[PDB]
Amino acid sequence: HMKISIIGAGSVRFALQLVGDIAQTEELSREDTHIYMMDVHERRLNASYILARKYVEELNSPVKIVKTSSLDEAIDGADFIINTAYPYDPRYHDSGSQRWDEVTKVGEKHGYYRGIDSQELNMVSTYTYVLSSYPDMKLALEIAEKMKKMAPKAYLMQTANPVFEITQAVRRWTGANIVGFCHGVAGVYEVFEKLDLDPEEVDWQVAGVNHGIWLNRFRYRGEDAYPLLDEWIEKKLPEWEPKNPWDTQMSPAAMDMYKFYGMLPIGDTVRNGSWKYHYNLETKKKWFGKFGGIDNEVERPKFHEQLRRARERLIKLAEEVQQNPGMKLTEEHPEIFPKGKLSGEQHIPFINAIANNKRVRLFLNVENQGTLKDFPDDVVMELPVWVDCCGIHREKVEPDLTHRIKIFYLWPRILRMEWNLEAYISRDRKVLEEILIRDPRTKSYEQIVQVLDEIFNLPFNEELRRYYK
Amino acid sequence: HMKISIIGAGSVRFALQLVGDIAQTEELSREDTHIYMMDVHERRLNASYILARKYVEELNSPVKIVKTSSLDEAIDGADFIINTAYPYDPRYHDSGSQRWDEVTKVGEKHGYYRGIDSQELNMVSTYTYVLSSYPDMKLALEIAEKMKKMAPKAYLMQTANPVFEITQAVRRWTGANIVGFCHGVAGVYEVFEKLDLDPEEVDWQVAGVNHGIWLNRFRYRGEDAYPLLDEWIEKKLPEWEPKNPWDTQMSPAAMDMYKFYGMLPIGDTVRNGSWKYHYNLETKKKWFGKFGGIDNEVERPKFHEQLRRARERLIKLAEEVQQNPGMKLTEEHPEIFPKGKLSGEQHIPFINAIANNKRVRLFLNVENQGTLKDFPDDVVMELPVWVDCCGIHREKVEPDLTHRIKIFYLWPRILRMEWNLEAYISRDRKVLEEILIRDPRTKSYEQIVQVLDEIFNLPFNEELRRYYK
């Protein structure tokens, strides 16, 4: 059979997306495809299981769906393990984002705007937790060790953040077959839209690290197409406005980074700039438009609440279907339960490529292996790759990333990953302190000790405190 | 013949040291050894030439000394070119340190303690000038290009700062035969003194980058000797006091860095810590003793004045000998004009090794070439090497530098070098701005623009201003 396990299936909307794509994929929608939905939160998990079963039934897909609260059961003999879990202690929080929002508030209380987890080239909210991301790294490493014994052939498809740090740590310290997933590359198609270019006529490539990728190749009709971006910056940038807090691809911050680095940052990379664009909310609004981007004290909590409500709606909807077996989720809520339309995410296409030799081009976090020759072979990069029955095949990255991207962006970001990994494995608070000593917002050493003490002293950080004792 | 050219011979005390060592070296004190003393400041140069001639005469050395204000004449057919020049416009300053002190004061005026040239892992006073060190890099690159045509076999022995940035820039952009010189390694012998160890019984090694070197090997009687340092930290560190502003080898800052990195920083590396030890003068005094080290608003100007007076004394002494040919400099001032004692610096031993196959172990700034396998081959490192008639031979660095030294110290410092080089060659103010955007002392972007504007607007920075226009 074929066993696909979603760890953290309590993440309802993502689980349903994964189930919808599987049921709408010919080579996978088979009675021999078993989808295990695993989580430690039964209310969330139950809702996801009920909605997934009904969704499949309305799609007339014969896939079998199994619910379990046992991590071992989900891993045992799995072919693909999708880690979308975001650990949180329910005694204190409703989601993982809620413990991040709390430590961040404590950071801001001590003078660290947007929390100590917001650093240069690393502003994406909820990416790291107290620098070392202890609970997320711990869970990923547990899964990696369990599957080396209970599922040696399985792919561990890491989606929970930090993808870069975690994929790197698992690869380096376990050798488990882990691949990091994030589709920040989807931003390029807007670039093409704004420049009036058929994306099918555009010869393009993107490369870098997770949330740190660059449009290294951008050609059209046999010539460099960046002069067309230059034209857009001059004529249409002054009139640019963000449609919502997430709209940053064509923002002044992206184009300023482009002017400096020589290539356009893509996707979340525009959020991960230097402190030039993020000193405060007013500065964010100059470089990102009226919302100030997403990673600020207004929009990040707002967005997290929108997720909380959206989650409860789905849970309530799961109670409704149990009461109204006749209602068709495909009809009542098409945007959540689409028919005949794939999500476009890479997770299920990846599985169909490995298991059914359906070759496809994807952007995945894997070891460099000389793809970017100026960087170590074992450093995990977000690279363009072709996946099929027999492995992941890296494309040649040409043109190479510019000299400035390497020395001012990729390398400082790679070192931060190494800092974070060292802080985890060493169990040494002094490494956490050294990271904050490189932090521009630090005014004194005593400040560093006190912000960490309060974070470590939060009631839901007992494990973290004992870990670093 | 043998032609040894001192570029910047106006640096009187160093020139006399170089001349004294040559005249006291058997294989070099020959009529066929010609010492060219070159500089653009005649008062300084004349004083150095007069004192050098008298010194040689009292040593009964037959070496010929030539004075010239022509850089070409000094380079033409030279066998070794010693660059100890520190450019400065005499219309405004008396030495190079005086233009550094002025820009630093402007930096502090804008909220950058110890000037924008003081950065993490880079606190040594007068090491870089406005980040890119324009006048020093320019002169070094001029010399390198002139000698590729007028002296292809010559060694360019770079002593003027920044040694790291300059040696790297010359190697990479000209391929001239440049080697960087600095004897920060001399600090190890004090470590041995304090621990009651015969330095001859100590199997030790040091490696890193310029002003960024580490005691990677420290063994005694067949065992790791660092436990003896551990003992010293516990028993004798509390009673440590600095003999003078330069005494930092056994300071609390050095031992704190040792506790973190696992190896003891050596020499000037103790000055080049994180901002933890340098937020302000009071913080410096906690981690360096009562003087607060040398790199502060009190001791750095004090020391520079001590150099000014010491320089004028020598110039006045040169006028005295012209009036009293009978006086013996060897007798009246033995510390400046020693007999039968070498300085211990590496410059002349290096020359005697290349030209006379007198093999010796030295610590020189040369391309890595796989010595530290985790770093690029072309990056200039301060390595232990054996020099003889036919090349520079790198020792094996064992134990390897610790993981923390690499990711928290060497790599961040190497990237800064790349930042500085990029700022020079690009002629792009935005690179200078990006460097300051990574600066913890920056509070806003407008601050960066204004501090650079005032620095660029200083009257003696016309060339620098036009360069970056």
mmCIF file of N, CA and C in Angstrom, chain B residues 121-125 127 182-192 204-216 226 240 245-251 253-255 257-258 263-273 278 287-288 293-295 363 382 409:
data_model
loop_
_atom_site.group_PDB
_atom_site.id
_atom_site.type_symbol
_atom_site.label_atom_id
_atom_site.label_comp_id
_atom_site.label_asym_id
_atom_site.label_seq_id
_atom_site.Cartn_x
_atom_site.Cartn_y
_atom_site.Cartn_z
ATOM 1 N N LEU B 121 34.387 42.714 16.615
ATOM 2 C CA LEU B 121 35.559 41.958 16.177
ATOM 3 C C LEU B 121 36.572 42.838 15.451
ATOM 4 N N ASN B 122 36.473 44.154 15.635
ATOM 5 C CA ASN B 122 37.324 45.100 14.927
ATOM 6 C C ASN B 122 37.393 46.415 15.697
ATOM 7 N N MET B 123 38.026 46.386 16.873
ATOM 8 C CA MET B 123 38.141 47.549 17.742
ATOM 9 C C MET B 123 39.526 48.181 17.717
ATOM 10 N N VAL B 124 40.526 47.494 17.168
ATOM 11 C CA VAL B 124 41.887 48.018 17.115
ATOM 12 C C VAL B 124 41.863 49.400 16.478
ATOM 13 N N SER B 125 42.343 50.401 17.213
ATOM 14 C CA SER B 125 42.342 51.767 16.712
ATOM 15 C C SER B 125 43.157 51.882 15.429
ATOM 16 N N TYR B 127 42.736 50.887 12.422
ATOM 17 C CA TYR B 127 42.889 49.730 11.547
ATOM 18 C C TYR B 127 42.255 49.966 10.179
ATOM 19 N N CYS B 182 52.315 41.012 10.778
ATOM 20 C CA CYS B 182 51.912 41.493 12.097
ATOM 21 C C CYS B 182 52.285 40.433 13.130
ATOM 22 N N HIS B 183 52.881 40.866 14.244
ATOM 23 C CA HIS B 183 53.397 39.925 15.235
ATOM 24 C C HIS B 183 52.522 39.889 16.482
ATOM 25 N N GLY B 184 51.205 39.804 16.295
ATOM 26 C CA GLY B 184 50.317 39.622 17.428
ATOM 27 C C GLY B 184 50.576 38.345 18.199
ATOM 28 N N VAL B 185 51.290 37.393 17.593
ATOM 29 C CA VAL B 185 51.552 36.111 18.234
ATOM 30 C C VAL B 185 52.462 36.243 19.447
ATOM 31 N N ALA B 186 53.206 37.345 19.561
ATOM 32 C CA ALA B 186 54.124 37.522 20.682
ATOM 33 C C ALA B 186 53.430 37.448 22.036
ATOM 34 N N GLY B 187 52.098 37.502 22.075
ATOM 35 C CA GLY B 187 51.386 37.443 23.339
ATOM 36 C C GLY B 187 51.431 36.093 24.027
ATOM 37 N N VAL B 188 51.706 35.015 23.285
ATOM 38 C CA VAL B 188 51.651 33.684 23.884
ATOM 39 C C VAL B 188 52.684 33.537 24.993
ATOM 40 N N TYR B 189 53.847 34.174 24.843
ATOM 41 C CA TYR B 189 54.913 33.969 25.817
ATOM 42 C C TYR B 189 54.536 34.510 27.190
ATOM 43 N N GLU B 190 53.669 35.525 27.247
ATOM 44 C CA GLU B 190 53.170 35.974 28.542
ATOM 45 C C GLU B 190 52.263 34.921 29.166
ATOM 46 N N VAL B 191 51.376 34.324 28.365
ATOM 47 C CA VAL B 191 50.549 33.226 28.859
ATOM 48 C C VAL B 191 51.427 32.188 29.543
ATOM 49 N N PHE B 192 52.516 31.797 28.878
ATOM 50 C CA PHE B 192 53.419 30.809 29.457
ATOM 51 C C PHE B 192 54.058 31.340 30.735
ATOM 52 N N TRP B 204 53.031 24.512 21.081
ATOM 53 C CA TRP B 204 51.920 25.425 20.857
ATOM 54 C C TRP B 204 51.810 25.814 19.388
ATOM 55 N N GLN B 205 50.612 26.262 19.013
ATOM 56 C CA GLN B 205 50.334 26.738 17.665
ATOM 57 C C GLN B 205 49.256 27.810 17.750
ATOM 58 N N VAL B 206 49.272 28.730 16.790
ATOM 59 C CA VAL B 206 48.300 29.819 16.727
ATOM 60 C C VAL B 206 47.856 29.992 15.281
ATOM 61 N N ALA B 207 46.582 30.326 15.087
ATOM 62 C CA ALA B 207 46.056 30.478 13.738
ATOM 63 C C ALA B 207 44.788 31.318 13.769
ATOM 64 N N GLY B 208 44.473 31.910 12.620
ATOM 65 C CA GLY B 208 43.257 32.685 12.464
ATOM 66 C C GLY B 208 43.392 33.685 11.337
ATOM 67 N N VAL B 209 42.841 34.882 11.514
ATOM 68 C CA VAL B 209 43.093 35.996 10.614
ATOM 69 C C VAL B 209 43.837 37.082 11.386
ATOM 70 N N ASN B 210 44.306 38.090 10.654
ATOM 71 C CA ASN B 210 45.040 39.185 11.275
ATOM 72 C C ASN B 210 44.215 39.795 12.399
ATOM 73 N N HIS B 211 44.842 39.950 13.564
ATOM 74 C CA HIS B 211 44.154 40.449 14.751
ATOM 75 C C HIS B 211 42.957 39.574 15.105
ATOM 76 N N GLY B 212 43.006 38.310 14.695
ATOM 77 C CA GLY B 212 41.928 37.373 14.936
ATOM 78 C C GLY B 212 42.464 35.961 15.026
ATOM 79 N N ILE B 213 43.481 35.780 15.866
ATOM 80 C CA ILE B 213 44.232 34.536 15.962
ATOM 81 C C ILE B 213 43.936 33.876 17.298
ATOM 82 N N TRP B 214 44.063 32.552 17.323
ATOM 83 C CA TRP B 214 43.647 31.756 18.466
ATOM 84 C C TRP B 214 44.705 30.716 18.786
ATOM 85 N N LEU B 215 44.904 30.477 20.081
ATOM 86 C CA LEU B 215 45.857 29.475 20.553
ATOM 87 C C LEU B 215 45.205 28.107 20.375
ATOM 88 N N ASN B 216 45.256 27.610 19.137
ATOM 89 C CA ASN B 216 44.547 26.376 18.815
ATOM 90 C C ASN B 216 45.225 25.156 19.427
ATOM 91 N N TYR B 226 45.561 23.414 28.633
ATOM 92 C CA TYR B 226 44.514 24.385 28.917
ATOM 93 C C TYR B 226 43.955 24.206 30.326
ATOM 94 N N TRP B 240 44.188 39.926 38.893
ATOM 95 C CA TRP B 240 44.847 40.450 37.706
ATOM 96 C C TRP B 240 44.666 41.958 37.603
ATOM 97 N N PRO B 245 47.886 50.440 29.508
ATOM 98 C CA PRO B 245 46.692 50.313 28.659
ATOM 99 C C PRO B 245 46.782 49.212 27.619
ATOM 100 N N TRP B 246 47.982 48.731 27.289
ATOM 101 C CA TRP B 246 48.144 47.683 26.289
ATOM 102 C C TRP B 246 48.008 46.275 26.856
ATOM 103 N N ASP B 247 48.023 46.119 28.176
ATOM 104 C CA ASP B 247 48.037 44.801 28.805
ATOM 105 C C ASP B 247 46.618 44.247 28.848
ATOM 106 N N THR B 248 46.327 43.281 27.972
ATOM 107 C CA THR B 248 45.008 42.667 27.929
ATOM 108 C C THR B 248 45.045 41.153 27.792
ATOM 109 N N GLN B 249 46.222 40.544 27.640
ATOM 110 C CA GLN B 249 46.275 39.134 27.269
ATOM 111 C C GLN B 249 45.592 38.257 28.310
ATOM 112 N N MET B 250 45.806 38.545 29.593
ATOM 113 C CA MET B 250 45.228 37.763 30.677
ATOM 114 C C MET B 250 44.017 38.446 31.308
ATOM 115 N N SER B 251 43.370 39.349 30.580
ATOM 116 C CA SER B 251 42.273 40.140 31.115
ATOM 117 C C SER B 251 41.002 39.310 31.222
ATOM 118 N N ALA B 253 38.249 39.916 29.759
ATOM 119 C CA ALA B 253 37.685 39.808 28.417
ATOM 120 C C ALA B 253 38.301 38.644 27.652
ATOM 121 N N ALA B 254 39.618 38.466 27.760
ATOM 122 C CA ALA B 254 40.257 37.348 27.076
ATOM 123 C C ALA B 254 39.745 36.020 27.614
ATOM 124 N N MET B 255 39.620 35.908 28.938
ATOM 125 C CA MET B 255 39.204 34.648 29.540
ATOM 126 C C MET B 255 37.724 34.378 29.308
ATOM 127 N N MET B 257 36.128 35.318 26.515
ATOM 128 C CA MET B 257 36.158 34.802 25.152
ATOM 129 C C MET B 257 36.663 33.365 25.133
ATOM 130 N N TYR B 258 37.684 33.068 25.939
ATOM 131 C CA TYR B 258 38.184 31.701 26.027
ATOM 132 C C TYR B 258 37.096 30.746 26.503
ATOM 133 N N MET B 263 39.178 28.271 22.927
ATOM 134 C CA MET B 263 40.593 28.560 22.755
ATOM 135 C C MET B 263 40.829 30.013 23.136
ATOM 136 N N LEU B 264 42.040 30.304 23.582
ATOM 137 C CA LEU B 264 42.355 31.646 24.061
ATOM 138 C C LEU B 264 42.656 32.567 22.884
ATOM 139 N N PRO B 265 41.993 33.721 22.783
ATOM 140 C CA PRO B 265 42.425 34.717 21.793
ATOM 141 C C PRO B 265 43.798 35.261 22.151
ATOM 142 N N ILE B 266 44.598 35.535 21.126
ATOM 143 C CA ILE B 266 45.996 35.901 21.307
ATOM 144 C C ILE B 266 46.225 37.310 20.781
ATOM 145 N N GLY B 267 46.991 38.094 21.540
ATOM 146 C CA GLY B 267 47.422 39.400 21.076
ATOM 147 C C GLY B 267 46.266 40.358 20.878
ATOM 148 N N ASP B 268 46.316 41.094 19.764
ATOM 149 C CA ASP B 268 45.299 42.094 19.472
ATOM 150 C C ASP B 268 43.910 41.493 19.352
ATOM 151 N N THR B 269 43.814 40.173 19.170
ATOM 152 C CA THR B 269 42.509 39.529 19.100
ATOM 153 C C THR B 269 41.694 39.785 20.361
ATOM 154 N N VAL B 270 42.362 39.995 21.496
ATOM 155 C CA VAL B 270 41.624 40.268 22.722
ATOM 156 C C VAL B 270 40.954 41.630 22.637
ATOM 157 N N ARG B 271 41.549 42.563 21.890
ATOM 158 C CA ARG B 271 40.909 43.854 21.669
ATOM 159 C C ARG B 271 39.703 43.719 20.748
ATOM 160 N N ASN B 272 39.729 42.744 19.842
ATOM 161 C CA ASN B 272 38.699 42.595 18.814
ATOM 162 C C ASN B 272 37.638 41.585 19.242
ATOM 163 N N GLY B 273 36.914 41.930 20.305
ATOM 164 C CA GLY B 273 35.801 41.137 20.769
ATOM 165 C C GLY B 273 34.470 41.642 20.238
ATOM 166 N N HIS B 278 32.643 46.472 25.103
ATOM 167 C CA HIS B 278 33.017 47.782 24.586
ATOM 168 C C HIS B 278 31.861 48.774 24.465
ATOM 169 N N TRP B 287 36.045 44.881 31.922
ATOM 170 C CA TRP B 287 36.569 43.730 31.201
ATOM 171 C C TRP B 287 38.043 43.855 30.841
ATOM 172 N N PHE B 288 38.670 45.007 31.093
ATOM 173 C CA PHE B 288 40.078 45.194 30.771
ATOM 174 C C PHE B 288 40.893 45.804 31.901
ATOM 175 N N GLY B 293 41.480 49.219 28.604
ATOM 176 C CA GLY B 293 42.170 48.892 27.377
ATOM 177 C C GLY B 293 42.761 50.136 26.730
ATOM 178 N N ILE B 294 43.110 49.990 25.452
ATOM 179 C CA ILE B 294 43.780 51.053 24.710
ATOM 180 C C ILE B 294 42.801 51.762 23.783
ATOM 181 N N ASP B 295 41.749 51.060 23.366
ATOM 182 C CA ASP B 295 40.845 51.559 22.331
ATOM 183 C C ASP B 295 39.648 52.291 22.942
ATOM 184 N N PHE B 363 54.734 33.914 11.375
ATOM 185 C CA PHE B 363 53.278 34.014 11.330
ATOM 186 C C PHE B 363 52.922 35.155 10.389
ATOM 187 N N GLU B 382 46.205 34.580 8.816
ATOM 188 C CA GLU B 382 47.462 34.705 9.554
ATOM 189 C C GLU B 382 47.821 33.310 10.048
ATOM 190 N N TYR B 409 33.170 33.934 14.988
ATOM 191 C CA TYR B 409 34.271 34.890 14.934
ATOM 192 C C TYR B 409 34.879 34.983 13.533
#
